[PDB]
């Protein structure tokens, strides 16, 4: 039967953790990958995260298969200009925790933005990717690496001609 070794790759090991973009696995296929450009200026952060995740995880392809991890890369630009509906910018919490007794970190989207807006976008993309796939580390991780984030309008992927991503809101 299948046997996953107890000797795993650990963040503290010199070998380090991999990048699934450069990995080669039976369930990774970058041949059919495309590149999209998502300008998140004036677009609500949750909506932008959901739209980006739909393409990142590959659910937008009719050949989608949950086992196979194939998705199109998405370059998100102008994350600094991302909008929140109302007072949510300071009334929406982000909560994490360490193994220590105190441990708990409660922070505001304002603080997350002041540190790194791309971090906030990454948090929301992670929430979507976990909402849809949470039972496997590879599935939880690979689409996030497929995703690309940039707070400004300058990105180095101009050598890939990322086509602008056009969508419509539910309204």
């Amino acid at each position: 039967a299948p046997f996953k070794s107890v000797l795993r790759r650990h963040k503290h090991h010199p070998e380090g953790l991999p990048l699934y973009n450069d990995m080669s696995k039976q369930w990774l296929c970058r041949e059919g990958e495309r590149w999209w450009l998502l300008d998140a200026r004036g677009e609500q952060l949750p909506r932008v995260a959901a739209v980006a995740a739909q393409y990142i995880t590959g659910q937008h392809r009719p050949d989608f298969t949950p086992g196979m991890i194939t998705g199109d890369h998405v370059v998100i630009v102008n994350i600094k200009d991302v909008v929140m509906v109302g007072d949510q910018w300071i009334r929406v919490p982000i909560t994490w925790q360490t193994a220590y007794p105190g441990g708990k970190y409660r922070i505001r989207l304002t603080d997350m933005y002041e540190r790194d807006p791309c971090m906030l976008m990454w948090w929301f993309l992670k929430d979507e990717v976990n909402r849809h796939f949470v039972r496997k580390l590879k599935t939880r991780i690979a689409p996030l690496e497929k995703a690309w984030l940039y707070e400004d309008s300058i990105h180095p992927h101009a050598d890939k001609n990322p086509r602008p991503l056009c969508w419509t809101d539910p309204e």
Binding site: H12, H13, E15, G16, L19, Q26, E31, T65
Partner: protein, 534 residues
């Protein structure tokens, strides 16, 4: 050398790089000087010796000298520009993870991983060659450099860029600029005197474009239309990849003309190059029948085996006994069990030629174990091949060697920088030649490769080995197929490295689907389930 780079001249630097580029190989992992293995955690990591820092410091000194101190030297001297780029391609500057990887199956991340606690602080995120590559790209993008360069220099420059780039393809802007300049020069100089060397340069440029994944339609049409001189191996290798029936037919006609001209001129080097490029192109071809007829009439097997080192006797024997082998080879490669049952029924109802797979399928079916040989097996020594040939005389085991495997062994013996590998591969060629001479082994000539492999699939050594394994598993299940190959080889996991991407027309049962192509079994572990790497 790193200290004295700034004080050296162009010729001195060229000699320096030429001398330094010795130990490295193309397919190998440059700057991978792994000596000590530390396995205190449980998953070993290999620590490179002092050579890697030496090369890193040399590259840094070269960058400082040719970018931050003397930026005009690269523009002035195109030869140095090509030499530096070729050196940076030979050493995987943009893939430093290979510098620390010990096996392709478990690639390392010591060059792209860095944790706050202290892991990989001294081996992660080195800007090795980034500044120099950026400066070279800017020099190309701004050209006086291309104006000073020669067509050969331009082809070498484009090849160097596509080799340096980790994906194997040059930047879009650089590729476009170089291609435009080369096309302008070809159009301006073709009207004047032209030479077979110029044609070879154009063919090399076309092959470089195909490798960089573009396609120069103008160059292709020019080569197809021109008939003053025969084409070289580069053109056939380039047109092998494309998919177009008329283009393939025209390329086949050109290949026939070129082979005839080479035979008439008795140029051994040109004949062998054309034979290799042909082999590749014919494997690419879709019409397996016409490809097989072409190979049989042009005598690919005999000439290739003669070109090999210790295979002259087997080449002569194969040429003598070709008719019997062809007569014994069946028409259809599916329902082999049914065909064997019918032959047995016919036999029930009231000398020895050279052993080859397709003619001796029944012998293989009778045999219990079959070892498929691979070139990588003898990377260091011939002990495992000696063990296989010792197992051969048991009568219950057989050894299968492929023409692609023999070609790989010969090329790596003649080109590999490792003297141990060269001697081991020569010894392996001698052993295989002796075994084929005695008949205790099995050979799969190029004609049989054409007959067996998929319709229009290009097969290297690994792909041919896996097609043979899939055919044995699908038509002769009761034969236990083992594979002899180096543990570091990536072909040990076809479903992980040799996979054509997410294809809707394949499934885990395509291995047993008689009508499906053999290579469809790559996408599934069932092929690996039935084939054992020992």
């Amino acid at each position: 050398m790193a200290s004295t780079v700034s004080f050296r001249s162009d010729e001195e630097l060229l000699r320096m790089f030429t001398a330094i580029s010795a130990p490295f190989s193309v397919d190998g992992r440059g700057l991978n000087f792994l000596t000590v293995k530390v396995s205190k955690f449980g998953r070993p990591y290999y620590v490179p010796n002092s050579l890697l820092p030496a090369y890193v410091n040399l590259v840094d000194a070269t960058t400082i000298a040719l970018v931050r101190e003397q930026p005009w030297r690269l523009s002035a001297s195109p030869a140095l520009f090509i030499q530096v780029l070729q050196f940076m391609a030979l050493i995987k500057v943009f893939e430093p993870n290979k510098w620390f990887t010990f096996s392709d199956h478990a690639p390392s991340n010591r060059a792209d991983y860095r944790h706050a606690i202290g892991v990989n602080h001294s081996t992660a995120f080195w800007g090795t060659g980034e500044e120099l590559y950026d400066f070279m790209v800017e020099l190309l993008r701004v050209p006086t450099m291309l104006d000073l360069c020669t067509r050969e220099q331009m082809v070498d420059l484009l090849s160097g860029f596509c080799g340096v780039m980790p994906c194997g393809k040059a930047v879009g802007d650089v590729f476009k600029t170089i291609t435009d300049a080369f096309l302008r020069r070809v159009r301006n100089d073709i009207s004047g005197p032209w030479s077979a060397h110029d044609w070879a340069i154009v063919e090399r440029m076309y092959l470089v474009t195909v490798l960089c994944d573009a396609g120069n339609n103008e160059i292709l049409q020019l080569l197809l239309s021109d008939t003053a001189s025969p084409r070289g191996p580069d053109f056939f290798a380039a047109v092998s990849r494309t998919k177009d029936t008329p283009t393939k037919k025209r390329a086949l006609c050109l290949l026939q003309e070129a082979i005839d001209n080479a035979s008439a001129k008795a140029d051994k080097v040109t004949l062998l190059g054309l034979l290799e490029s042909g082999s590749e192109f014919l494997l690419s071809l879709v019409d397996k029948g016409v490809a097989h007829t072409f190979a049989t009439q042009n005598l690919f097997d005999y000439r290739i085996l003669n070109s090999f080192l210790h295979c002259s006797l087997v080449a002569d024997r194969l040429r003598v006994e070709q008719s019997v082998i062809t007569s014994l080879i069946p028409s259809s490669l599916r329902d082999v069990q049914v065909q064997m049952l019918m032959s047995n029924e016919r036999n029930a109802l009231n000398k020895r030629p050279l052993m080859t797979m397709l003619s001796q399928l029944e012998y293989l079916n009778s045999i219990d174990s079959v070892f498929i040989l691979h070139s990588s097996l003898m990377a260091t020594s011939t002990d495992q091949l000696v063990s296989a040939v010792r197992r051969l005389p048991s009568g219950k085991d057989s050894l299968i060697v492929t023409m692609s495997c023999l070609r790989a062994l010969s090329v790596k013996s003649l080109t590999s920088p490792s003297m141990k590998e060269r001697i081991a591969c020569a010894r392996a060629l001698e052993i295989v030649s002796y075994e084929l001479e005695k008949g205790r082994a099995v050979l799969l000539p190029f004609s049989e490769e054409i007959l067996l492999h998929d319709a229009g699939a290009y097969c290297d050594e690994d792909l041919m080995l896996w097609t043979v394994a899939a055919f044995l598993a699908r038509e002769l299940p009761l034969v236990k197929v083992h594979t002899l190959m180096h543990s570091n080889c990536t072909a040990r996991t076809p479903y992980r490295f040799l996979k054509g991407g997410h294809n809707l027309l394949v499934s885990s049962r395509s291995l047993y689907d008689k009508g499906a192509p053999l290579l469809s079994s790559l996408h599934s572990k069932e092929l690996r389930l039935v084939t054992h790497n020992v």
